[PDB]
Amino acid sequence: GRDQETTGFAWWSGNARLINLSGKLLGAHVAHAGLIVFWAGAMNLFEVSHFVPEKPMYEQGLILLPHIATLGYGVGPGGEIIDTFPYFVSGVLHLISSAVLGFGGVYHSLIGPETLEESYPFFGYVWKDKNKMTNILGYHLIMLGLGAWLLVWKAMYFGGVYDTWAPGGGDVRVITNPTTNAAVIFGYLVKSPFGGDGWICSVDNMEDIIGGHIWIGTLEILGGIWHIYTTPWPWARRAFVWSGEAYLSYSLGAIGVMGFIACCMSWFNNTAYPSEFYGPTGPEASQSQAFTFLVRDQRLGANVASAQGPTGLGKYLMRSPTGEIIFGGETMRFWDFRGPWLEPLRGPNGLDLNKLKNDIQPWQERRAAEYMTHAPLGSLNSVGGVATEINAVNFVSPRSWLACSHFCLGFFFFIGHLWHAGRARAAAAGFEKGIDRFDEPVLSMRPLD
Amino acid sequence: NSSLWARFCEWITSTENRLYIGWFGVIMIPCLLTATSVFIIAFIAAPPVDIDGIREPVSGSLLYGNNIITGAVIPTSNAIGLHFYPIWEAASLDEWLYNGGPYQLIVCHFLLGVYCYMGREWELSFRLGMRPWIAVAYSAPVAAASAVFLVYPIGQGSFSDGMPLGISGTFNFMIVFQAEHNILMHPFHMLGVAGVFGGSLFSAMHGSLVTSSLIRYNIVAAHGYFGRLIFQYASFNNSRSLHFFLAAWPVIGIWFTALGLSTMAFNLNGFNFNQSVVDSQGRVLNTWADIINRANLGMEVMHERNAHNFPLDLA
Amino acid sequence: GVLGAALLCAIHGATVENTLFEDGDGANTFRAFNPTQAEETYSMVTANRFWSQIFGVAFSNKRWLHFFMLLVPVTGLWMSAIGVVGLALNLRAYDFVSQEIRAAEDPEFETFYTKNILLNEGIRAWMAAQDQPHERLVFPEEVLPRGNAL
């Protein structure tokens, strides 16, 4: 390694010493990738060893198996689990690949050349080259596009994906006709993020997801080919800082925005995140409680339509501010929730009274009861329910954990963008160490502001 | 000479102005002034707003039998939920007033204004040849404001759960939040309280030590005094280290308390310790945590008088 | 006062650490400081200009700045102590008579103040049963204040 005198960076900033050491930086990146893959494999194996297939996944606090199940591995109709071997296979494959990646990282960090700008000119790069950086960006864009097309092929040819909107309970299906229409695909991006619209979190079918992934894979391949054979235009050079920390800051900002989007999507979406694996969402639990109470009261004998509440609005059914028939009570805020177990009861103008009378199947009632029981509410002690509850339950929904953790990570990475962008701009300007003390810019300015 | 745009950008990015109108300023100023104008007009006079969505409004305007302490800009109606509710989407202006549009308008413009204010802080730091990390410190109150006004409504699914823009609204929101989430028992609120108390302590101590050492730039005698006092010699003898610690403590505390707020926004409450100490037979022994639970239970039953209609408060 | 003290601490730390003079080489600025030096380690003029152009008003005297940092929290806690002294004799700033009268007269009048009053009443009634055993209070479930909506 190095020391402070040679580099100028203290131990608590030691990784900053690798900015101009391509070999060591590459070794560090490879070792970190090996760490990521190792955690993936180890956690997959841990969840497999503790998984009881009889109980639902969301009732055991599993966060990685739901992804593989959504991919459509070892899952039958309604989310029932047939066998758990594919999860074991994925875990062991990630584990061994992580072993290989870790060996590569430790080699490139300890034995490999410190700087590879002259021995391996293809892999060498200067942070201000402005042409090799685009080459690397194009290579990785092509790789990302290949990954997206791999997902598309998995959903289209090799087996299928878990469609939760299939008739009855959802099941594995092949997406024979993905939605490739440009208008439909690009309507999501420009849609408003507020309530009712929800931006890309409003995808409600697997066809749209697969078509969008086709689009993004093709666009990424084309963009990679573009960037390999091109250098940034003068207007691009005019409005960017060309240094390693600047690129790091750009990536930090983008990935923080990605973390926020992931938080919102995990909390709200239930198509790419089936409730049979991740548990019911926030609105889903309340809607399910209202539906179950309405069904029970109607079975006991009552007029659900003519059931005026204490405030006069309506105990069971009322009207939304747009005009649709919705469940009444404090759940009015969740009136735009949509779920496979509730849609068959919806007509052109909201919930249909006639369908609510004699068109409710037993599976819908059972799913509603199960979801209303396991609300996303929880506690830091893994208690469950409202804060004023006894210690009798050990449930916190995986959706809550995912949302909280990824929001925290996104916020910290936005802070990282701020810090690193500011420092990169200052260092490129040249005053990141301090004021000159002999050519101070303020002293040459007109006083009184 | 130079074109129109060159002169315009020279004027905008000029350090000779009394107040720096940065490129972030060009958005900060209109949004902040719009929010200020709407807030002032609504506070002075605005009809009662149906916060609960149950056809009963609450008044928070001075012209409607209120004072400074009890006045507030009532949050958006529950029936609206998270829907965007601009002026042009309402049939009439009075309907916009009734449903609680001004709160949404003020919140949106104010959040944009504070984000651009942080950006402008960075910009003027850059234009004067300074190290640009004042904005990083300023982000902590910005993060707290975003969690209070935006993240919590998103997690709870409605803007009616946000903080009202009024003094009594703050206390009502705090009582509500403690009742529903047990804020006091969360480690992140404890860290925020620790950060605030430590900020006050270090502010007072640093002020006293520096002022006492400014005899007829701090001398080394203050370090010796501090070492003799609390038996922490060499803990802080570098001025840069001391001032960095002063900056770092409260910022980290506020970051963590804002993160705890945003975490509870997604129904991840604090610690639960009721019914923990149990007799040998099986009887439950009360603890101070159980008295806190009793207070929370009392807060919860009178939470919404006529809004709920189901046994469990899932919303 | 307490929040202002925390704010002053944060701003003073950030401003001092972001206006240092380039007194040494390398990026680690902490090492570029001699405790025995007789020269200022940060530019007061630059900080003054920055805060006067961002906020509108900025400090120009070090002694006054540090005395203000000393003075804010001390005053805040002294005033809190006076308030607690007032509470010790049940001299409470509990209610506003005008709004209470208006709410009693008009059943449609609701403000956040009245909701806070209701929450306080609920706290008292539901907590005094076990908080103060020496009163031997036994409240029937039908007299405890409770939102009738359930």
Binding site: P447 | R18, I44, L62, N67, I68 | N48, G56, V57, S60
Partner: peptide
Amino acid sequence: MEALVYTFLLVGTLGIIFFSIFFRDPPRMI
């Protein structure tokens, strides 16, 4: 009446803030 008093107090405070920001004593020899 009382609303007018509150409005006058707030307007006066804002005016004092404006005067302090703009009609300030120029700082010399920082």
